[PDB]
Every structure is written in structure tokens, then in C-alpha cells.
Amino acid sequence: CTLKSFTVEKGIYQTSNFRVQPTESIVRFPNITNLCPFDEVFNATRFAS
Amino acid sequence: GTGVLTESNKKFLPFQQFGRDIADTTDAVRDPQTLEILDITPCSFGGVSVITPGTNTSNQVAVLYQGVNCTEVPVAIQLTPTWRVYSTGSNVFQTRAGCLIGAEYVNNSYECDIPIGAGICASYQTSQSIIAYTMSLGAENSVAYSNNSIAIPTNFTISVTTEILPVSMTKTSVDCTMYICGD
Amino acid sequence: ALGKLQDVVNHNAQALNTLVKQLSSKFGAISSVLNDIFSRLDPPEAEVQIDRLITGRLQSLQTYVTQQLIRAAEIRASANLAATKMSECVLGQSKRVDFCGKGYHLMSFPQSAPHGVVFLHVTYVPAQEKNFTTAPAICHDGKAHFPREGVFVSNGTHWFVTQRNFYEPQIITTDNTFVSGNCDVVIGIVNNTVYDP
Amino acid sequence: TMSLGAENSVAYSNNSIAIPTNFTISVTTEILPVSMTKTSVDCTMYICGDSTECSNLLLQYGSFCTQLKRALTGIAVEQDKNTQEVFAQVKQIYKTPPIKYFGGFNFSQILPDPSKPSKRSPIEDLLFNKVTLADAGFIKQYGDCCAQKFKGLTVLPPLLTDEMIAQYTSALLAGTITSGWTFGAGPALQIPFPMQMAYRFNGIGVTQNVLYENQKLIANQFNSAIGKIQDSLSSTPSALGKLQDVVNHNAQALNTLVKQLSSKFGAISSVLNDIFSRLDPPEAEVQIDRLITGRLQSLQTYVTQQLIRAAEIRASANLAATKMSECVLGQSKRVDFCGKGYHLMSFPQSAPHGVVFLHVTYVPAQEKNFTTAPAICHDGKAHFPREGVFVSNGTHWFVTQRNFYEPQIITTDNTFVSGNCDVVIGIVNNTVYDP
Amino acid sequence: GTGVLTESNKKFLPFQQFGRDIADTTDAVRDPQTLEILDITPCSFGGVSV
Ligand SMILES: *[C@@H]1O[C@H](CO)[C@@H](O[C@@H]2O[C@H](CO)[C@@H](O)[C@H](O)[C@H]2NC(C)=O)[C@H](O)[C@H]1NC(C)=O
Ligand SMILES: *[C@@H]1O[C@H](CO)[C@@H](O[C@@H]2O[C@H](CO)[C@@H](O)[C@H](O)[C@H]2NC(C)=O)[C@H](O)[C@H]1NC(C)=O
Ligand SMILES: *[C@@H]1O[C@H](CO)[C@@H](O[C@@H]2O[C@H](CO)[C@@H](O)[C@H](O)[C@H]2NC(C)=O)[C@H](O)[C@H]1NC(C)=O
Ligand SMILES: *[C@@H]1O[C@H](CO)[C@@H](O[C@@H]2O[C@H](CO)[C@@H](O)[C@H](O)[C@H]2NC(C)=O)[C@H](O)[C@H]1NC(C)=O
Ligand SMILES: *[C@@H]1O[C@H](CO)[C@@H](O[C@@H]2O[C@H](CO)[C@@H](O)[C@H](O)[C@H]2NC(C)=O)[C@H](O)[C@H]1NC(C)=O
Ligand SMILES: *[C@@H]1O[C@H](CO)[C@@H](O[C@@H]2O[C@H](CO)[C@@H](O)[C@H](O)[C@H]2NC(C)=O)[C@H](O)[C@H]1NC(C)=O
Ligand SMILES: *[C@@H]1O[C@H](CO)[C@@H](O[C@@H]2O[C@H](CO)[C@@H](O)[C@H](O)[C@H]2NC(C)=O)[C@H](O)[C@H]1NC(C)=O
Ligand SMILES: *[C@@H]1O[C@H](CO)[C@@H](O[C@@H]2O[C@H](CO)[C@@H](O)[C@H](O)[C@H]2NC(C)=O)[C@H](O)[C@H]1NC(C)=O
Ligand SMILES: *[C@@H]1O[C@H](CO)[C@@H](O[C@@H]2O[C@H](CO)[C@@H](O)[C@H](O)[C@H]2NC(C)=O)[C@H](O)[C@H]1NC(C)=O
Ligand SMILES: *[C@@H]1O[C@H](CO)[C@@H](O[C@@H]2O[C@H](CO)[C@@H](O)[C@H](O)[C@H]2NC(C)=O)[C@H](O)[C@H]1NC(C)=O
Numbered sequence: 044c045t046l047k048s049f050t051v052e053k054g055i056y057q058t059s060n061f062r063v064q065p066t067e068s069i070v071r072f073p074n075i076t077n078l079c080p081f082d083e084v085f086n087a088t089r090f091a092s
Numbered sequence: 093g094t095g096v097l098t099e100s101n102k103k104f105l106p107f108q109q110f111g112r113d114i115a116d117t118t119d120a121v122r123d124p125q126t127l128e129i130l131d132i133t134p135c136s137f138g139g140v141s142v143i144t145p146g147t148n149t150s151n152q153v154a155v156l157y158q159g160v161n162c163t164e165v166p167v168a169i170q171l172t173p174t175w176r177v178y179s180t181g182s183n184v185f186q187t188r189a190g191c192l193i194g195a196e197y198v199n200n201s202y203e204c205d206i207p208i209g210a211g212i213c214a215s216y217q218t219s220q221s222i223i224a225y226t227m228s229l230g231a232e233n234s235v236a237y238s239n240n241s242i243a244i245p246t247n248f249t250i251s252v253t254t255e256i257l258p259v260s261m262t263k264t265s266v267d268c269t270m271y272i273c274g275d
Numbered sequence: 276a277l278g279k280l281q282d283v284v285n286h287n288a289q290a291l292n293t294l295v296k297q298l299s300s301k302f303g304a305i306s307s308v309l310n311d312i313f314s315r316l317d318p319p320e321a322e323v324q325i326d327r328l329i330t331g332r333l334q335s336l337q338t339y340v341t342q343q344l345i346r347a348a349e350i351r352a353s354a355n356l357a358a359t360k361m362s363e364c365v366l367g368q369s370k371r372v373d374f375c376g377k378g379y380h381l382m383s384f385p386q387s388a389p390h391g392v393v394f395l396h397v398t399y400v401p402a403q404e405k406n407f408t409t410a411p412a413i414c415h416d417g418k419a420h421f422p423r424e425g426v427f428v429s430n431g432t433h434w435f436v437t438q439r440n441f442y443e444p445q446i447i448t449t450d451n452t453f454v455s456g457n458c459d460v461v462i463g464i465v466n467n468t469v470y471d472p
Numbered sequence: 473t474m475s476l477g478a479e480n481s482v483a484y485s486n487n488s489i490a491i492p493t494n495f496t497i498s499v500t501t502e503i504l505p506v507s508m509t510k511t512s513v514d515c516t517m518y519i520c521g522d523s524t525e526c527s528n529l530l531l532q533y534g535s536f537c538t539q540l541k542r543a544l545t546g547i548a549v550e551q552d553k554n555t556q557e558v559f560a561q562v563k564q565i566y567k568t569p570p571i572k573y574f575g576g577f578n579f580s581q582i583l584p585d586p587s588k589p590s591k592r593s594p595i596e597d598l599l600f601n602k603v604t605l606a607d608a609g610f611i612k613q614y615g616d617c618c619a620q621k622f623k624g625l626t627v628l629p630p631l632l633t634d635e636m637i638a639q640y641t642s643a644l645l646a647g648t649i650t651s652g653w654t655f656g657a658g659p660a661l662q663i664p665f666p667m668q669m670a671y672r673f674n675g676i677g678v679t680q681n682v683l684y685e686n687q688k689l690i691a692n693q694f695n696s697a698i699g700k701i702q703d704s705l706s707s708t709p710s711a712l713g714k715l716q717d718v719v720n721h722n723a724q725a726l727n728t729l730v731k732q733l734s735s736k737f738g739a740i741s742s743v744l745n746d747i748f749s750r751l752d753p754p755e756a757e758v759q760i761d762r763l764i765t766g767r768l769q770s771l772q773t774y775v776t777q778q779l780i781r782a783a784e785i786r787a788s789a790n791l792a793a794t795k796m797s798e799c800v801l802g803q804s805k806r807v808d809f810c811g812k813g814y815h816l817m818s819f820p821q822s823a824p825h826g827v828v829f830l831h832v833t834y835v836p837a838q839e840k841n842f843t844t845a846p847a848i849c850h851d852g853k854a855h856f857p858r859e860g861v862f863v864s865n866g867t868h869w870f871v872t873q874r875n876f877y878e879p880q881i882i883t884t885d886n887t888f889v890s891g892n893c894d895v896v897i898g899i900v901n902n903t904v905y906d907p
Numbered sequence: 908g909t910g911v912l913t914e915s916n917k918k919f920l921p922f923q924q925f926g927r928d929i930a931d932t933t934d935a936v937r938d939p940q941t942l943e944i945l946d947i948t949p950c951s952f953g954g955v956s957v
């Protein structure tokens with residue numbers, strides 16, 4: 044295929060490359076904790092009119 | 093990024109988060125969740141080269157995996173997936189040039205036929221299989237030198253040898269306008 | 276070895292074929308056909324795609340000339356070597372080792388070949404060597420004698436002087452040797468009789 | 473302002489001649505690059521780093537990857553050939569005799585040393601250690617690491633390892649010591665070494681009797697001269713710069729290629745994923761196009777530089793190939809081709825990516841003024857010296873070889889007769905002794 | 908395009924209408940009106956040297 048010929052002469056030919064594909068994706072946690080306190084405002088006793 | 097992740101012996105300053113090599117490619121990263129420094133190495137890759145005696149002298153081929161251990165990337169490994177690389181049963185030889193598959197090694201030394209590299213050459217020899225060997229540097233002869241030993245030829249032969257020298261190449265002209273803008 | 280001449284032909288044929296194949300390259304444009312772009316893209320924006328093609332063809336042409344220029348230098352170096360070989364080997368006997376054939380060079384015959392030249396080097400190589408015992412000089416009458424153009428040899432009984440390349444022993448005479456110094460200084464001198472004609 | 477050299481004048485005068493009294497054997501070193509580093513490039517990896525879209529966009533650009541790969545492959549094959557031509561000039565490997573006594577000389581500095589695990593001469597190691605201070609590859613990181621790489625740039629090992637190359641230099645040295653020039657022309661013929669040097673003395677026009685009379689003096693000069701080579705080589709002044717320049721040039725070119733990756737080439741940024749993420753796919757490809765072309769043009773430029781650089785290396789290799797054939801394998805009449813002065817013999821020494829030649833040359837010294845005449849009139853017939861010069865020490869006339877002052881009485885054997893006495897200019901009354 | 912239109916002996920299979928050369932340039936065509944095989948050759952040209 045690379046030589047584009049049906050016959051090949053004796054020798055050494057570079058053809059392609061091989062690469063190991065990734066197996067699984069992954070992502071890491073910034074360990075975020077700055078949660079928004081808007082929830083407890085919704086979770087309040089009294090509410091303005 | 094993509095690569096094999098492993099723990100690293102590198103030491104990062106607290107504000108340091110990633111590290112780059114000489115070529116300014118990310119070679120180490122600090123994990124966000126855990127303060128551990130993890131080394132990144134690219135997934136194994138390399139060129140593949142095929143040794144053949146010639147289509148008409150058999151069809152068996154020998155595959156060279158350049159610049160990688162046979163261990164890391166054996167017949168188990170995809171790219172050229174239909175290539176099973178035969179099997180581990182097929183002779184696997186480790187050379188400085190790279191992994192070699194489909195050829196065996198012998199202690200007998202012949203003249204080089206197909207230059208693998210790093211002092212290794214392959215050929216088709218007897219039953220008929222691709223065989224890899226170390227180059228025979230030449231026949232070994234020791235000449236007897238002494239204080240008073242002289243060798244003088246008694247008889248001669250006339251030899252005719254041929255030398256081939258290129259002299260001229262094809263003269264070519266290009267009509268640029270037609271080539272770049274044809275009709 | 277005619278492949279050396281053949282490789283010159285193939286490289287030019289291969290390079291030209293590579294240039295031809297480059298035309299089909301789109302070079303990031305819509306298509307590789309100049310006419311189709313113009314009918315498909317109006318002049319206000321067609322030149323954007325044409326320029327991509329023009330640059331692509333121009334780059335391919337530029338590389339081809341550069342490759343030819345580099346290759347031409349290699350041929351010229353070969354041509355100069357051939358010219359020197361024709362002058363030094365064909366037109367005269369060359370003392371340079373291995374410049375004309377292998378071994379001592381006698382003559383060279385030029386033969387024309389397509390896009391090259393073939394040299395038939397007539398060389399003299401020795402054979403059938405025979406060991407001998409030698410001595411740097413011969414002491415005859417208290418005076419050291421040195422071979423004028425040969426080397427002293429003996430088969431074991433009688434010493435002889437002969438030419439270096441061919442074995443032709445001769446009786447050591449005052450004509451074959453020139454006398455210098457005395458016998459003590461020379462290391463390895465050997466007693467023998469020097470015949471006087 | 474540069475001073476070209478020390479101003480010198482020579483007292484040219486008719487009938488005035490200067491002849492050396494004796495000589496000085498000098499060993500000069502000459503270094504020639506032979507082969508450069510064999511390199512290959514992964515076309516896709518360099519242009520696109522783990523980007524499928526760039527990989528797709530790379531396909532329609534053309535068959536440049538095939539073209540670039542072929543160009544570098546031709547260079548790599550040529551490099552192995554260059555090494556083969558320089559060193560593989562001996563059909564048969566020769567072994568040094570077990571006894572190392574050669575008429576009073578060493579060759580121990582240049583002969584391979586069995587003590588070292590690497591079968592290299594002491595001089596070879598000094599060349600190796602000095603050059604390898606700035607070297608590349610080493611193990612080549614065959615095991616996991618680095619030496620560039622991971623960008624597509626790889627280094628291919630040479631066909632011939634250093635050890636086998638050293639064997640060739642060892643084989644050449646053994647043949648030259650034991651056989652002189654004979655093994656180059658044909659079958660190797662042994663010849664006692666003092667006789668071999670005597671032959672080479674005749675080649676440069678010095679009668680062999682001179683060598684045998686001063687064998688001890690010559691041997692000491694030769695041994696001492698070799699010793700100075702090690703000190704001069706091990707000295708900080710680096711004559712190995714030519715070999716170093718090849719290493720630097722390849723490293724400089726490769727470093728430029730890596731640097732070119734960071735270039736934006738007119739795009740907004742040099743990060744492929746940044747282009748795709750920040751820009752919409754319609755506009756993103758425009759920047760990708762510029763980056764691909766810019767990276768390509770960088771790759772094309774590097775190939776052209778390598779191809780040009782491959783020329784003189786082959787030219788240097790071709791010159792080295794002739795020098796090994798013309799100087800090592802025989803005496804060379806060509807002036808200054810093999811060292812400075814009258815060439816006697818040359819010893820090849822392998823070096824990283826090159827070869828070092830040790831030219832042994834004959835240098836005259838301690839000249840003396842003399843009075844000379846073109847011919848001698850004795851019996852009404854002019855006498856001409858057959859080889860020597862006609863010199864008068866002041867009151868008598870002698871004939872001596874041109875290079876060495878070895879006066880002799882004028883005899884009919886030393887001089888051939890031709891013509892009368894009046895025609896020639898500068899003839900001188902004298903008597904020609906007849907034995 | 909511009910060229911010389913001639914009858915062509917190359918046989919096109921019934922589905923085939925276009926023919927291409929080594930350079931991947933259209934070398935033959937089937938006429939839309941009447942199904943016939945026509946090859947296209949560029950008009951005569953040549954370098955001029957004085
Ligand atoms: C945020 O990071 C901390 C440490 O930086 C994590 O704590 C881990 O688990 C316990 C409880 O804090 C510690 O004793 C361990 O030493 C921590 N492990 C490591 C590897 O550091 C904490 O779990 C992280 N936040 C979340 C939500 O997981
Ligand atoms: C001349 O005679 C000597 C003495 O035997 C030869 O030296 C040995 O020759 C044989 C075969 O010829 C070798 O196998 C030995 O190795 C030689 N001896 C040593 C110490 O090497 C010498 O070879 C003879 N000359 C020729 C041309 O054969
Ligand atoms: C010199 O060498 C030549 C060639 O190596 C040989 O001559 C041959 O001698 C044999 C026996 O006399 C003949 O049958 C051959 O025909 C000769 N060769 C040729 C080419 O004619 C022999 O070794 C030596 N000859 C002499 C005369 O010394
Ligand atoms: C060494 O060479 C000489 C020269 O041929 C040999 O001496 C001659 O040998 C032949 C054959 O026996 C006799 O016919 C001659 O009379 C010899 N010449 C003299 C002057 O005696 C000698 O024999 C050779 N050495 C050996 C050991 O054969
Ligand atoms: C060669 O012969 C000479 C002379 O016969 C030897 O030199 C010395 O000569 C004197 C008088 O002629 C003798 O009294 C000595 O006995 C000789 N020396 C020796 C060691 O006997 C010379 O030695 C001889 N050399 C060889 C190698 O035979
Ligand atoms: C030898 O050399 C000397 C000086 O180098 C020559 O002396 C002069 O030569 C020129 C050249 O013809 C004459 O014109 C002068 O007249 C010479 N000087 C005197 C004082 O006469 C001398 O001529 C040379 N010998 C010969 C034979 O020409
Ligand atoms: C030849 O030239 C050499 C130059 O080295 C002279 O050799 C020196 O000779 C003196 C006295 O004999 C010794 O002390 C030195 O050691 C010698 N030099 C070396 C390097 O060993 C020699 O004198 C010259 N010969 C003539 C006849 O002038
Ligand atoms: C040449 O002959 C000498 C004998 O003179 C030997 O070489 C060495 O010579 C020195 C001094 O003469 C002796 O001390 C050594 O013992 C000799 N070497 C050996 C191994 O005995 C030797 O016979 C010859 N040289 C060779 C064959 O290279
Ligand atoms: C041959 O040269 C060698 C190497 O210089 C000599 O051997 C050395 O001699 C020196 C004398 O100062 C000493 O350092 C050692 O004995 C040897 N080795 C080294 C590494 O220097 C030797 O003397 C010379 N002559 C011979 C061997 O006959
Ligand atoms: C030029 O001629 C000869 C050279 O051999 C010298 O003459 C000899 O001188 C020595 C002492 O100086 C005498 O013992 C010899 O008897 C002399 N021989 C002859 C033949 O004259 C002469 O001295 C040389 N000239 C100079 C200036 O040295």
C-alpha cells in the first residue's frame with residue numbers, strides 16, 4: 044500500500060507508526076467547597092411580602 | 093492531556109501546579125484533590141518497519157518495532173489491528189535498534205543482507221525462514237611478522253574491474269503558468 | 276552496479292511524479308480544480324480559495340526546484356570526479372592507490388553509458404607469495420652494502436637480491452648494491468660475499 | 473591590524489645552495505567528519521499533537537509526509553554508506569602479532585588496548601571522552617525515561633557500532649605495521665618494519681642507508697612524537713571542534729524545530745485545543761490552517777537544511793575515504809595531502825562521528841650553506857650528477873643527495889657525461905675520480 | 908474547460924460517464940445529450956526559444 048506497487052523488492056521499509064490508545068477518560072476534583080448559601084435563604088422561617 | 097500517569101519524585105513548590113520538560117511539554121502535574129505530584133509520560137509509540145526478502149522469494153515478513161522494549165509492546169498490542177504481529181511463539185529478539193518479530197537469531201555470522209542496524213542484519217536462509225544475525229566483519233587472517241621474514245610474490249594476475257559514475261541528469265523545464273494555472 | 280545510473284533516472288522520474296500528484300491536493304481549498312472554484316465561488320471571495328491553491332502549487336514547485344538544485348550538485352561532484360578519473364586514469368598511469376581500480380594500476384578504458392560513464396580498470400595484482408629470510412644489509416669486506424633497487428633475500432643457503440614486486444633472484448654484485456658506512460652500525464647486517472665483475 | 477606572519481628573507485644567489493644536515497620526524501593529527509546523526513520524524517505527531525481534527529485536516533494537504541520521510545530516509549542510508557566507504561576498505565580482518573616489538577617503536581598508544589573492556593587504543597579513548605562530553609543518544613532511552621522525542625523527532629542507531637568500527641581501524645593498523653602498502657594492493661605480505669620504513673625513505677628521495685644508520689635516533693623521535701599527541705589532544709585546546717560542530721549543528725537544528733512549535737505563525741495562539749475550544753468550528757479551522765502551514769513550512773525548511781548539510785559531510789567522507797586509501801594504504805607523493813612535510817605513513821584512529829588521521833612526516837632541519845655548480849668540467853666533457861647535487865665544502869667538490877647532506881667524492885659512477893664544457897653556464901674546473 | 912474534443916476508443920461501462928488520467932484530471936467524458944465517449948486533449952502548446 045505504501046510503496047503503491049503489487050511487487051516489493053528485498054529490503055527494509057518503514058510503513059507506519061503504532062500508538063497505544065487511551066483506555067478511559069478521567070478528570071480530577073479541585074475539591075471545591077465554596078457552596079452557595081442561597082439554599083438556607085429559601086429554607087427560612089419568615090419571608091417578605 | 094493523554095498519557096500514562098504515575099507518581100513522581102519531583103518536588104514542587106506550594107504554588108507550583110504543573111511542570112514542563114526542556115521541550116516545554118507538560119511532564120509533571122500536581123493533583124488538584126490530593127497534593128501528590130504525578131508524573132505524565134506519553135503512551136508508548138514508535139515506528140514500524142517491515143523486512144522482506146522480496147515478494148517472489150517467499151512472502152514471509154519480519155516486523156521491527158523501532159526504539160521500544162519488546163516487553164512494553166509485545167504481540168499483545170489498535171494501530172494496524174489486523175496485524176497480530178504473529179505471536180510470542182514467533183521468535184522475539186531485542187536489539188538496540190528496536191523490537192524484532194518473526195526472525196530468529198543465530199550465532200553464525202554472515203555478511204549483511206538487509207541492514208537492521210546497531211550491528212544486526214537479516215536475510216532469507218535455510219526450512220527457508222527469515223534469519224537475523226550479527227554482521228561478519230570479514231574473514232580473519234593473521235600475518236606472520238618476524239624480524240627477518242619477507243614475502244615476495246612469484247607470479248601475478250591481471251584483473252579488470254569496472255567503475256560506474258553518473259555524469260549528467262535529465263534536463264527538465266517547467267512552464268510555471270500552465271502548471272499553476274492550467275487553462 | 277548499473278543501479279547507480281538507474282537511481283539517477285528513477286529519482287528524477289519519482290520527483291516529477293510527486294510534482295504531478297501534488298496537483299490533486301486541495302491545500303485547504305474547496306476543490307483542486309481551478310475552474311470549478313470560480314463558478315462555485317463569486318469573485319469577491321473566490322480569490323481567498325484561489326490563493327490557497329496558488330500558494331500550494333507554488334510551494335510544491337519551489338521545493339521541486341530546490342531538490343533538483345541539491346541533486347544537481349551531487350551529480351556535478353560526480354562529474355568532476357569522473358573528469359579527474361578520465362584524465363588521471365585513462366590518459367595516464369596514476370600512482371594514487373585505489374583511485375583507478377584495485378591494486379597497482381596499469382591502464383583504464385572508458386566506456387560510454389546512458390547518463391554516465393563506465394571505466395574498465397586494468398590492474399596488476401600479485402599472487403603466489405613465497406616467504407624468504409632477509410637482511411637489511413650485507414657485510415663483505417668490513418663495508419656495509421645496500422641493495423640499490425631491490426631487497427636482499429636467501430632461500431636458506433645463498434643470498435640474493437631481487438625486485439620488490441616480482442621474484443627474480445640475482446647474484447649480489449657491486450652493480451646491484453651501493454656501499455655505505457661500515458658493518459658495525461647497521462643492525463641485523465649479515466655476512467656474505469659480494470661478487471665483483 | 474593582523475600580522476600575516478614573521479617577515480623572512482632567504483639569501484637567493486647563483487651558486488649558493490642550502491642542504492639540511494639531518495631531519496625531524498613529526499606526527500601531525502588531522503580530523504575529518506565522516507557521518508552525522510541519523511534522524512527521523514513522525515510527520516503527524518509534530519504537526520498535530522493528539523488532535524484528530526488536525527489529523528483529518530492534515531490528510532487533504534497532500535503526500536508531504538511520504539515526501540519528507542523519503543528525504544530523511546535517503547540521508548539515513550547515505551550516512552551508513554559513508555562510514556562503510558571510509559573504514560571498509562580491507563577485505564580481510566588482520567590481527568596484530570602477539571609480540572609488540574617493532575624495530576624499537578611502540579604503537580601501543582595507537583594499538584588497541586586489551587585491558588579496557590572496549591577494544592580501543594589509548595588515543596581512541598581520549599578522543600572518545602573529549603567528544604562525548606557533548607554527545608547525544610547514549611542508551612537512547614530504550615528503557616523508559618527525554619533527548620527530545622515525544623514530538624516525533626527520533627534518532628536512529630548507526631548500522632556499525634563503535635566496537636566493530638574500532639576493529640576496522642585495528643585491522644588497518646595491523647596490516648600497515650606488518651605489510652606496509654602490500655595488503656592494500658593485494659594479498660598481505662609480511663615485511664620487517666625497519667625495512668618497511670627504509671622503503672618509504674626511498675620514496676621521499678632519501679637513500680635507505682640513512683635510516684639504518686640512524687635507526688635508534690628515528691625510533692626515539694617517533695616514540696616521543698606520539699607521546700606529544702596525547703598531551704596535545706588531552707589539552708583543553710580542542711582540535712576536535714570539527715567533530716563537535718556536527719553535533720552542535722544537529723542539536724541546533726533540532727532545537728529550532730522544537731522552538732518552531734511554540735510559534736503561533738500568525739494565529740491567535742499556539743495551542744491546538746485552545747483554537748478549537750475558544751473559536752467556533754468555522755473560524756477555528758482558519759487559525760488551524762495557518763498553524764498547520766506554518767509548522768509544515770518549518771518541517772520543510774529543516775529537511776532542506778539537513779539535505780544541504782548532508783552534502784559536505786559526504787564530501788568530507790569522500791575526502792576521508794581517499795585519505796585512508798592514499799595515505800594509510802600507501803605513501804602519497806601529493807604535497808600536503810597527508811600532513812605537512814614529506815609524507816611517510818599515516819595511522820587511522822576512529823573517532824565519534826569521524827576519523828582522526830596520524831600523519832608521520834619527514835621534516836628536514838639544521839640546514840647549511842654550500843657553494844654549487846651545475847656541472848663539472850674534467851676532461852673537456854661536462855659531467856652532470858646522476859641524482860645528487862654538486863656541492864663544494866669550500867675547497868673540494870662533492871656530490872650529495874638533495875635532502876640529506878651525505879657528501880661523496882665525484883666519480884664516473886655518480887655522474888653521467890654529455891656534451892662539451894663551453895655550452896653549459898656556470899661549469900667549474902674540477903677532477904672526476906675514475907675508479 | 909478548453910481543449911480538443913475527439914472520439915475515444917476507451918470503453919465506458921454504462922454507469923461510467925467521466926474518465927480521469929494519472930494526474931487525476933478529467934480525460935474523457937460522456938456527452939449528456941447522446942451517450943458517447945469523448946476524450947479531451949489540451950490545445951497545442953510548446954516552449955518558444957529565440
Ligand atoms: C479535600 O482534600 C482533603 C485533603 O487535602 C481530603 O481529605 C482526605 O481524607 C481525610 C479527611 O480529610 C484526610 O485525613 C486525608 O489525608 C485526605 N486524603 C488525601 C489523599 O489528601 C478531602 O477528602 C478532600 N475533599 C473531598 C470532598 O474529598
Ligand atoms: C614462511 O614460513 C613461516 C614459518 O613456518 C610461515 O609462518 C607460519 O605459516 C603458517 C602457514 O604458512 C601459518 O599458519 C602460521 O601462523 C605462520 N606462523 C606464525 C607465527 O604466524 C609463513 O607463513 C611462511 N610464509 C608464507 C607466505 O606462507
Ligand atoms: C603464473 O600464474 C598463472 C596464472 O595464475 C599460471 O599460468 C598457468 O599455468 C598452467 C600450468 O602451466 C596453465 O595450465 C595455465 O593455462 C596458465 N594460465 C594461463 C592463464 O594461461 C601459473 O600459476 C604461473 N605461470 C607461470 C608460467 O609461471
Ligand atoms: C638457494 O638458491 C640457490 C640458487 O639456485 C641454490 O643453489 C643452486 O642449486 C642448484 C640445485 O641443486 C644447483 O644446481 C646449483 O649448483 C646451486 N648453486 C650453487 C652456487 O651452489 C640453492 O640450492 C638454494 N637453496 C636450497 C636449500 O635449495
Ligand atoms: C661477520 O664476520 C666478521 C669478520 O669475520 C665478524 O666480525 C669480527 O671480525 C673479527 C676479525 O675479522 C673476528 O675476530 C671476530 O670474531 C668477529 N666477530 C665475532 C662476533 O666473531 C662478525 O662477527 C661476523 N658476523 C656474523 C653475523 O657472522
Ligand atoms: C650571479 O648573480 C649576481 C647577483 O645576483 C649577478 O650580478 C649582476 O647580474 C645582473 C644580471 O645580468 C647584471 O646586470 C649585473 O651587472 C651583475 N652585477 C655586476 C656587479 O656585474 C651575476 O650576473 C650572476 N651571474 C651571471 C652569470 O649572470
Ligand atoms: C640530528 O638531529 C637531532 C635532533 O634531535 C640531534 O640529536 C640530538 O643529539 C644530541 C647529541 O648527540 C643529543 O644530546 C640529543 O638528545 C639528540 N636529540 C634527540 C631528540 O635525541 C643530532 O645531533 C643531529 N645529528 C647531527 C649529525 O647533527
Ligand atoms: C626480534 O628479535 C628480538 C631479539 O633481539 C626479539 O624481540 C625482543 O628483543 C628484546 C631485545 O633484543 C628482548 O629483550 C626480548 O625478549 C625480545 N622479545 C621476545 C618475545 O623474546 C624477538 O625475537 C624478535 N621480535 C619480534 C619477533 O617481534
Ligand atoms: C612503549 O611505549 C610504552 C607506552 O609509553 C612504554 O610503556 C610505559 O612505559 C612508561 C615509562 O615511563 C611507564 O609509564 C610504564 O612502564 C608503561 N606504561 C605506561 C602507561 O606508561 C614502553 O616503555 C615503550 N617501550 C617498549 C614497550 O618496549
Ligand atoms: C673540504 O674537503 C675535505 C673534506 O673531507 C677536508 O679536508 C680534510 O680535512 C681534515 C682535517 O680538517 C684532514 O685530516 C684531511 O686529511 C683532509 N682531507 C682532504 C682530502 O683534504 C677540508 O678541510 C674541507 N674543508 C673544510 C673547510 O672543512
Ligand SMILES: *[C@@H]1O[C@H](CO)[C@@H](O[C@@H]2O[C@H](CO)[C@@H](O)[C@H](O)[C@H]2NC(C)=O)[C@H](O)[C@H]1NC(C)=O
Binds near residue numbers: 900901
Ligand atoms: C676549466 O679548465 C679549462 C682547462 O684549462 C680552462 O680552459 C682554459 O682557459 C684558459 C683561460 O680562459 C685558456 O688560456 C686555455 O687555453 C683554456 N684551455 C682549455 C683546454 O680550454 C677553463 O678556463 C677552466 N674554467 C674555469 C671556469 O676556470
Ligand SMILES: *[C@@H]1O[C@H](CO)[C@@H](O)[C@H](O)[C@H]1NC(C)=O
Binds near residue numbers: 148149
Ligand atoms: C522474481 O519473481 C518473478 C515473478 O515470479 C520471476 O519472474 C523472477 O524470475 C524472480 N527473480 C529471481 C531472481 O528468481
Ligand SMILES: *[C@@H]1O[C@H](CO)[C@@H](O)[C@H](O)[C@H]1NC(C)=O
Binds near residue numbers: 199
Ligand atoms: C549464541 O548466542 C546466544 C545469545 O546471543 C547465547 O545464549 C548462546 O549460548 C550462543 N550459542 C549458542 C550455541 O546458541
Ligand SMILES: *[C@@H]1O[C@H](CO)[C@@H](O)[C@H](O)[C@H]1NC(C)=O
Binds near residue numbers: 161163615
Ligand atoms: C526493557 O525493560 C526492562 C524493565 O522492564 C529494563 O530493565 C530493560 O533495560 C529494557 N530493555 C533495554 C534494552 O533497556
Ligand SMILES: *[C@@H]1O[C@H](CO)[C@@H](O)[C@H](O)[C@H]1NC(C)=O
Binds near residue numbers: 483490839840841
Ligand atoms: C648563508 O649565508 C647568508 C649570507 O651570509 C646568511 O644570511 C644565511 O643565514 C646563511 N645560511 C645559513 C644556514 O647559515
Ligand SMILES: *[C@@H]1O[C@H](CO)[C@@H](O)[C@H](O)[C@H]1NC(C)=O
Binds near residue numbers: 939940941942
Ligand atoms: C433527450 O435526452 C435523451 C437522453 O440523453 C436522448 O436519448 C434523446 O435523444 C434526447 N432528445 C433528442 C431529441 O435528442
